[PDB]
Amino acid sequence: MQIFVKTLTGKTITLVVEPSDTIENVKAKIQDKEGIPPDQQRLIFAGKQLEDGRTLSDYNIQKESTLHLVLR
Ligand SMILES: [Zn+2]
Numbered sequence: 001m002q003i004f005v006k007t008l009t010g011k012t013i014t015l016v017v018e019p020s021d022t023i024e025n026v027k028a029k030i031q032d033k034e035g036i037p038p039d040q041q042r043l044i045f046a047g048k049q050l051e052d053g054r055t056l057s058d059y060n061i062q063k064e065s066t067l068h069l070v071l072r
């Protein structure tokens with residue numbers, strides 16, 4: 001399973017994930033890719049604000065979904 005995270009400049013990060021990954025796990029992967037601290041990261045999927053402790057499955061994030069990094 002992979003997801004796409006678009007940064008604030010529109011750069012695409014491609015991540016390998018699992019349905020049970022938390023948003024906090026995803027923020028750690030974005031930090032390794034781009035050097036963005038997790039506390040600087042805010043993510044949305046389909047208009048929903050994603051919380052660190054909830055999982056991809058909890059938000060119905062699927063293969064090939066796109067998330068966005070948005071302003072903190
Ligand atoms: Zn696993």
Ligand SMILES: [Zn+2]
Pocket residue numbers: 017018021025
């Ligand atoms: Zn994982």
